[PDB]
Amino acid sequence: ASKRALVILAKGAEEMDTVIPVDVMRRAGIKVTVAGLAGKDPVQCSRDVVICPDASLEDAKKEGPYDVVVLPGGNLGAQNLSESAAVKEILKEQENRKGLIAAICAGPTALLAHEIGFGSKVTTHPLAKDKMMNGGHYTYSENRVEKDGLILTSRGPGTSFEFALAIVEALNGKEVAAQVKAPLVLK
Amino acid sequence: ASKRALVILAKGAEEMDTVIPVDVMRRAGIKVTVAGLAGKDPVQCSRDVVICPDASLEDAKKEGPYDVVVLPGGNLGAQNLSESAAVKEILKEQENRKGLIAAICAGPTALLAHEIGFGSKVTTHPLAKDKMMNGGHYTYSENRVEKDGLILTSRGPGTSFEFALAIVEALNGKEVAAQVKAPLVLK
Numbered sequence: 245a246s247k248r249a250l251v252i253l254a255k256g257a258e259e260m261d262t263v264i265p266v267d268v269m270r271r272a273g274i275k276v277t278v279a280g281l282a283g284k285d286p287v288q289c290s291r292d293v294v295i296c297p298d299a300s301l302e303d304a305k306k307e308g309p310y311d312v313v314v315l316p317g318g319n320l321g322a323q324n325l326s327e328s329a330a331v332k333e334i335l336k337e338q339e340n341r342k343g344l345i346a347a348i349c350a351g352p353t354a355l356l357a358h359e360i361g362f363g364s365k366v367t368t369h370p371l372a373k374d375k376m377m378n379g380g381h382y383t384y385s386e387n388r389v390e391k392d393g394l395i396l397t398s399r400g401p402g403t404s405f406e407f408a409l410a411i412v413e414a415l416n417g418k419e420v421a422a423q424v425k426a427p428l429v430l431k
Numbered sequence: 432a433s434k435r436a437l438v439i440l441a442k443g444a445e446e447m448d449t450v451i452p453v454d455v456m457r458r459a460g461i462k463v464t465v466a467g468l469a470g471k472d473p474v475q476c477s478r479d480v481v482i483c484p485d486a487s488l489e490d491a492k493k494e495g496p497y498d499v500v501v502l503p504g505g506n507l508g509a510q511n512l513s514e515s516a517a518v519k520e521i522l523k524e525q526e527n528r529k530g531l532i533a534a535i536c537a538g539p540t541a542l543l544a545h546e547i548g549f550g551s552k553v554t555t556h557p558l559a560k561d562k563m564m565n566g567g568h569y570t571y572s573e574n575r576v577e578k579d580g581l582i583l584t585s586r587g588p589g590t591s592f593e594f595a596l597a598i599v600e601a602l603n604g605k606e607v608a609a610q611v612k613a614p615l616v617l618k
Contacts, residue, residue, distance in 0.1 A: 263450045267478040267588070278480070286473070286483050291454040293465070294483035296473050369616065388616070400616030401454070402592060429556065429575070429587030431618050 247274050247415040250310040252331060253297050254281040256320025259289035260401040261348045265314055268408035271424045272416050274311075279304035281324055281331070290318040301330055311415055313338050317349025317369065317400075326357035335360045339394070344414055346396040348407050352376055361395040369400050405430055434461050434602040437497040439518060440484050441468040443507025446476035447588040448535045452501055455595035458611045459603050461498075466491035468511055468518070477505040488517055498602055500525050504536025504556065504587075513544035522547045526581070531601055533583040535594050539563055548582040556587050592617055 249269050253262060262278075269276050280287055280297035287295050298304075313334060315325055325331050335358050338345055347355055349369040353376050355361050362381040367390040377384055388403045389396070389410045396414065398407035405428060413421040436456050440449060449465075456463050467474055467484035474482050485491075500521060502512055512518050522545050525532055534542055536556040540563050542548050549568040554577040564571055575590045576583070576597045583601065585594035592615060600608040 258454075259450050260454050263446050263480055264588070266480055267445075267447050270478045291457045292485075293450055293453055296481035296483060298479075369614075371614070400614070401451070402615040402617035405589060427556075427558070427587070428589040430589035 247311040249274050249276045249312045249314055249411070250304055250308065250334070251276060251278045251314045251316065252281055252301060252325060252334075253278055253287050253295060253316065254321045254324035255288055256318050256324060257287065257289050257316045258318035258321065258349060258401065259291055259293040259295065261316040261318065261351070261404055262289065262295065264404035265316070265346075265348070265408040265411065268405065268424060268428075269411060272412040272420055274412070274415060277304045277307070281328060290320065305330060305334055308334075309337065309341060309343060312344040312346050312411055314411070315345075315347035315351035315354050317351040319350045319372075322350035322353050325351070325354035332358045342394060344394050344396060344411070346407070346411050348398040348404060349400050352397045355395070356381065364395040365390055365392040366395060366397045367399050368397065434498040436461050436463045436499045436501055436598070437491055437495065437521070438463060438465045438501045438503065439468055439488060439512060439521075440465055440474050440482060440503065441508045441511035442475055443505050443511060444474065444476050444503045445505035445508065445536060445588065446478055446480040446482065448503040448505065448538070448591055449476065449482065451591035452503070452533075452535070452595040452598065455592065455611060455615075456598060459599040459607055461599070461602060464491045464494070468515060477507065492517060492521055495521075496524065496528060496530060499531040499533050499598055501598070502532075502534035502538035502541050504538040506537045506559075509537035509540050512538070512541035519545045529581060531581050531583060531598070533594070533598050535585040535591060536587050539584045542582070543568065551582040552577055552579040553582060553584045554586050555584065
């Protein structure tokens with residue numbers, strides 16, 4: 245049985261925050277669906293890399309549930325995730341079934357928007373801290389990767405390998421994470 | 432005047448090796464053209480991320496010269512780069528005009544194929560060393576980023592931020608590289 249990941253890709257997403265987890269999860273043997281928030285059409289990311297999703301979110305949501313739901317960052321991408329009723333329902337359903345939710349950089353601010361995981365320790369990009377902390381619903385961390393039960397968060401493009409490997413460890417174990425890590429040539 | 436980069440994107444390219452330099456160079460104010468080797472159509476990368484190029488290589492080559500030519504890795508992507516007469520002519524012209532050439536992971540093996548930069552110190556992914564060193568035309572290094580004049584090389588996805596920032600330093604200087612680096616949240 246392979247584990248399955250849903251990566252929700254919106255216009256303005258940070259392309260590094262998107263691609264590094266997709267690639268590293270696929271190296272781990274996870275079945276990853278890159279789902280376009282707005283449909284199946286190509287998505288223009290924050291630094292103008294254009295990525296073609298595997299499916300629309302409308303279609304991918306009918307194929308779950310997923311062992312992890314991943315929210316990339318990019319301020320405008322996270323804003324789009326935060327405004328979507330479909331994303332709200334996916335995350336609420338994932339939380340209710342005790343499934344992992346992973347978000348990086350500005351991505352965790354969509355958790356706030358959707359009232360997901362309140363009372364958890366979280367990290368974000370430093371510039372997203374004030375947005376995430378509005379109302380005091382989370383406890384903040386400066387760790388590069390933070391995991392408080394089912395809520396897994398991380399800080400930025402430069403923490404995206406660590407983030408992705410933490411997802412891999414959570415789903416497929418420490419040994420698979422270590423095996424996937426070595427050929428990456430990480431610090 | 433902004434500096435310009437040509438990133439040559441072939442089927443089977445490593446998507447992390449591709450996207451991290453494109454994004455980081457754009458953060459540095461470099462004008463980056465992601466050029467599809469085979470045409471303008473979307474490119475299926477090694478871990479199945481599909482990237483839409485900005486232009487075909489046929490068109491982008493008519494718009495140079497470029498201040499850097501970047502060759503991503505991925506074994507099958509590097510093989511495609513190595514087999515292309517267009518890539519041979521671009522790299523030969525770049526070498527002749529004393530322009531920077533940057534290649535990561537398996538990417539440097541296309542330099543060997545095209546007889547570019549012989550006599551330079553280079554690095555590659557560890558698994559690409561034997562291919563790169565066939566004939567002894569380069570001197571090998573285990574540094575995470577190696578630069579020997581105009582030939583700039585690096586090892587893997589996990590060295591791609593360092594690689595990209597070395598390109599930025601070469602084109603736009605140390606201060607711009609440091610400014611771009613800080614918001615990335617690197618180790």
